Design a protein around this ligand. Structure first.
Ligand SMILES: [Ca+2]
Length: 473
C-alpha cells in the first residue's frame, strides 16, 4: 500500500529508499511517498504549505507536538486511542507499562492525536552534572566536597592557594558554559536546589524564581561572586568559557553536559600534567542531594490525517516501530551492515564506529535512515553502543545513584490558555533575568528588594500562570 506522508527532520525530507524504510516496507507492505520534496529544507515552511492542501497526506509528522495536537482539535488529525486499543498491541502495552510516556501522547482534550518520538528516558535520564578538578583537591589536601558549604570552602581554597602553581591569583574556581542569561542561571542555581523555570513539587507546579530557595541561591551566588569564587565574567563569556578556562588551567569546577565535559581529561592530559576534571554527585544542601538537570521524554511525533482511507493499517505501521525488530531497525540500522548480533545483542560494525571519512556513528546511522525522527522509541542501548567510555561512566554513575529529578513535562494547553500563559511566562522571564543578573553581580540588596520583585511578578500575572500550569499538569 502506497501511503502519503509529510516528513522532514534536520532539514531533509524522508527518503523512503533509505535502507531502514525499505526494510520496514518489506516487513509491513507500507511504502511511504513523501509530499515534502528533496529540495525543501525549512520544515516549518513546508509543514505550513502542506496544511493549505484540500487533502492532507495519510500520515503527518512534525517536530512541534503542540501544532499536531491543535490540528487534531481542528479535526485534521484523527484520534488514535481507539485505534491503538483495538489494533496496535505494541503501543498498547508500551502505554500500559509507561504511564509517564502515555501522558506525553494525550492531548488537552483527552484524545491521542500523535505518537511522540520518545527518548529512552528511564534508561538514560542524564544531561548535565557537576565536575571538579580532582588534581587540585589532591594537591591542596582537600576532601571531595559533598555539601554546598564544603564546596564554598573548596572554591575559596582554589581561589587563594594557587593550585595551577604559577604564583598568580588567576584561578577561576567555578564557571559555566552558556550563551544567554537563562543558561547562566540554570548552571548556577541548581547547586542551591533552586530552579529558574517551572517545576513540580508535591504534585503541584510552581515557579522556580518565586521560591525561597531561589532567593537563597542568588544571595549565596552574589556572595561567592564578590569573593572571586564564581567567574567574574560568567555573564559575558560565551560558549568558549569551558574551553578557554580548562585549556589555560584556570577553571576548577563547573556544572555542564556530562558527555562533552568528560572529554577534557583525554584532550588535556599531554598539555596539563595531572589534569583530572572529575564528575561528582550533586552537592547536598539541607538534606537534598538531587539535580534538576534532566533529559526530556520526547521530541516531535506523527499522526494520521482525516484523509487517510485506511487508518487501521496505518496504526499498525505506527505499531511496527514498537515491535522488537522494528525498534531495533530504527535505532541500529540493518543487521550485517550497521551492526551484527553478538549473543543476541546489536554491536555496531566498523562502518559505524570507525568511518574512514571521520563521520560520527550517529551521522553514519542517519545516512541509512536510522534515528529519523517520526513517532518511534529511541533505545539507550543504541547510544551506549557508541558513546565514549567516560560518557557511559558518567551516565551510569548518575543513574545508579538516583540523583536526577524528572523535569516538568511538556504541558498541554488549549490555544487560548497557551497564549495567556506564554504572555505571562515571557514577561516574568524578562524581570527575573534582569533582577537576578544585577543581584548576582552585587547591585542593590536582594533582602530589601525581594518583596517588590515578587509583587512585580504577581502584577504581571504570576497567580494566573500558576492556575494555568496546575490545570495543565
Ligand atoms: Ca594561579
Amino acid at each position: 500500500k502506497e501511503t502519503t506522508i509529510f516528513a522532514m527532520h534536520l532539514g531533509k525530507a524522508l527518503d523512503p529508499n533509505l535502507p531502514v524504510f525499505v526494510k520496514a516496507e518489506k516487513d509491513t507492505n507500507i511504502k511511504l511517498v513523501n509530499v515534502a520534496s528533496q529540495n525543501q529544507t525549512d520544515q516549518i515552511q513546508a509543514y505550513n504549505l502542506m496544511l493549505t492542501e484540500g487533502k492532507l497526506p495519510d500520515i503527518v509528522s512534525y517536530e512541534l507536538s503542540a501544532d499536531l495536537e491543535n490540528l487534531g482539535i481542528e479535526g485534521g488529525l484523527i484520534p488514535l486511542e481507539d485505534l491503538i486499543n483495538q489494533h496496535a498491541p505494541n503501543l498498547k502495552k508500551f502505554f500500559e507499562e509507561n504511564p509517564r510516556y502515555k501522558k506525553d501522547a494525550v492531548a488537552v482534550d483527552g484524545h491521542i492525536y500523535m505518537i511522540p518520538n520518545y527518548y529512552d528516558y528511564f534508561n538514560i535520564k542524564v544531561s548535565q552534572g557537576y565536575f571538579i578538578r580532582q588534581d587540585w583537591l589532591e594537591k591542596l589536601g582537600l576532601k571531595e566536597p559533598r555539601t554546598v558549604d564544603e564546596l564554598y570552602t573548596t572554591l575559596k581554597a582554589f581561589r587563594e592557594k594557587d593550585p595551577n602553581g604559577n604564583g598568580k591569583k588567576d584561578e577561576v574556581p567555578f564557571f559555566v558554559r552558556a550563551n544567554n542569561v537563562r543558561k547562566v542561571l540554570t548552571s548556577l542555581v541548581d547547586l542551591f536546589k533552586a530552579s529558574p523555570i517551572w517545576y513540580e513539587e508535591n504534585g503541584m507546579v510552581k515557579y522556580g524564581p518565586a521560591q525561597k530557595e531561589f532567593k537563597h541561591a542568588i544571595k549565596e551566588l552574589s556572595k561567592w561572586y564578590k569573593e572571586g569564587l564564581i567567574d567574574e565574567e560568567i555573564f559575558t563569556r560565551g560558549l568558549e568559557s569551558r574551553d578557554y578556562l580548562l585549556s589555560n588551567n584556570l577553571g576548577g569546577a563547573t556544572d555542564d553536559w556530562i558527555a562533552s565535559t568528560s572529554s577534557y581529561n583525554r584532550n588535556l592530559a599531554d598539555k596539563i600534567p595531572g589534569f583530572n576534571l572529575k564528575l561528582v554527585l550533586p552537592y547536598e544542601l539541607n538534606g537534598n542531594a538531587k539535580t534538576r538537570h534532566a533529559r526530556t521524554t520526547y521530541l516531535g511525533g506523527w499522526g494520521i490525517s482525516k484523509d487517510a482511507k485506511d487508518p487501521v493499517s496505518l496504526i499498525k505501521y505506527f505499531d511496527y516501530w514498537y515491535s522488537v525488530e522494528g525498534r531495533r531497525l530504527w535505532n541500529f540500522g540493518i543487521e550485517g551492515s550497521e551492526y551484527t548480533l553478538v549473543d543476541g545483542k546489536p554491536v555496531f560494525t566498523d562502518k559505524v564506529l570507525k568511518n574512514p571519512d571521520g563521520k560520527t556513528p550517529l551521522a553514519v546511522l542517519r545516512e541509512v535512515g536510522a534515528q529519523y525522527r517520526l513517532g518511534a522509541f529511541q533505545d539507550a542501548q543504541y547510544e551506549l553502543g557508541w558513546a565514549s567510555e567516560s560518557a557511559k561512566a558518567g551516565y551510569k554513575y548518575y543513574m545508579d545513584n538516583d540523583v536526577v529529578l524528572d523535569e516538568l513535562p511538556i504541558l498541554k494547553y488549549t490555544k487560548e490558555k497557551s497564549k495567556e500563559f506564554v504572555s505571562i511566562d515571557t514577561a516574568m522571564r524578562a524581570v527575573v533575568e534582569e533582577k537576578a543578573q544585577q543581584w548576582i553581580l552585587g547591585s542593590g540588596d536582594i533582602d530589601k528588594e525581594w518583596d517588590a520583585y515578587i509583587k512585580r511578578l504577581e502584577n504581571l500575572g504570576l497567580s494566573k500562570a500558576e492556575q494555568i500550569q496546575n490545570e495543565a499538569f
